[PDB]
């Protein structure tokens, strides 16, 4: 019926590609096209802050001017698996169009 988006939920305009190999969903397995799926890049700490003080204490080399490693992963979510996880939520019609991009 009504078009809900000028974009149809894709990064793909008409007269661009046409296919866009699909990817698996973190948490689900749903195949969705790499445009559709909601990506997030993460940079996560290995250890909770109060767990760092313990381990960062217990190490000869680590924890002074040198820090711990982190977990770096992209996450590509099915649009269902993304809403349920709340990484994205519905938004009022006026606000549907907002692009955060990366700025600072």
């Amino acid at each position: 019926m009504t078009t809900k988006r000028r974009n149809h939920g894709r990064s793909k305009p008409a007269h661009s590609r046409g296919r866009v190999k699909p990817i698996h969903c973190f948490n689900c397995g749903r195949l969705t096209p790499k445009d559709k799926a909601v990506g997030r890049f993460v940079v996560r700490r290995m250890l909770d802050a109060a767990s760092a003080r313990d381990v960062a204490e217990a190490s000869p080399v680590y924890g002074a001017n040198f820090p711990m490693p982190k977990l770096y992963m992209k996450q590509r979510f099915c649009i269902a698996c993304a809403i349920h996880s709340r990484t994205v939520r519905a938004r009022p019609v006026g606000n549907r169009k907002i692009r955060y991009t990366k700025k600072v």
């Binding site: 890049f41 080399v61 040198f66 490693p69 982190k70 977990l71 770096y72 990366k102």
Partner: protein, 221 residues
């Protein structure tokens, strides 16, 4: 229990490294027809370069070096270079969206007989003035990196012996030169050597190993 029949050993490193004997391990008693040594050969042993050298407070805690046991002398374990790595988390933090990453592989056969793969990774840079939202490289400049990065690693490591070759890799002399020459093509952010693993070992020759370790340190045990 099991720690009873076990024995201890320390793992020597080639003399070009600083800390020589970096590890403590185990093997069963000779135990009849079985022989402790024959099982101890081929065991890879790992390290972190900042642990192994006394160098690098500054940039290398991030390279893992690993060795294989090619001989067993006394209570020691004598090794040879097996591979060099870049740690999982160091390599995952180099990536950036909006830049191009440019990877190569180079196979060199050293003067010493070993043929080693070399995995290089170069990242494009935004310029000072750069008003644009992209670092992306034209693909004819990408392909004219890979030819240099090959021609240099072929030319420099092929006329060298592993003893001098490993020191080029662990002291990042290559990486310094591979940037110097490959910088004028594309502005490069970092160009690193991700993995070195040594594919073919020429032979086993005792003298070649012994003169690789120099003066071997004591291992009570």
């Amino acid at each position: 229990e099991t720690m009873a029949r076990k024995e201890w050993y320390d793992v020597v490193a080639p003399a070009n490294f600083e800390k020589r004997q970096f590890a403590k391990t185990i093997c069963n008693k000779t135990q009849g027809t079985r022989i402790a040594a024959d099982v101890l050969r081929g065991r890879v042993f790992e390290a972190n370069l900042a642990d192994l050298n006394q160098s690098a407070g500054e940039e290398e805690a991030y390279r893992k070096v690993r060795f294989t046991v090619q001989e067993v002398q006394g209570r020691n374990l004598l090794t040879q270079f097996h591979s060099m790595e870049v740690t999982t988390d160091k390599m995952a933090s180099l990536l950036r969206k909006w830049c191009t990453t440019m990877e190569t592989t180079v196979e060199v056969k050293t003067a010493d007989g070993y043929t080693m793969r070399l995995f290089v990774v170069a990242f494009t840079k935004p310029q000072a003035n750069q008003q644009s939202r992209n670092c992306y490289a034209k693909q004819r400049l990408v392909k004219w990196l890979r030819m240099r990065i090959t021609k240099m690693i072929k030319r420099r490591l092929s006329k060298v012996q592993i003893k001098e070759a490993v020191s080029l890799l662990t002291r990042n002399v290559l990486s310094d030169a591979l940037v110097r020459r490959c910088n004028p093509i594309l502005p490069l952010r970092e160009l690193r050597i991700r993995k070195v693993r040594v594919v073919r070992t020429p032979k086993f020759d005792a003298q070649a190993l012994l003169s690789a370790h120099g003066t071997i340190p004591a291992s009570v045990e």
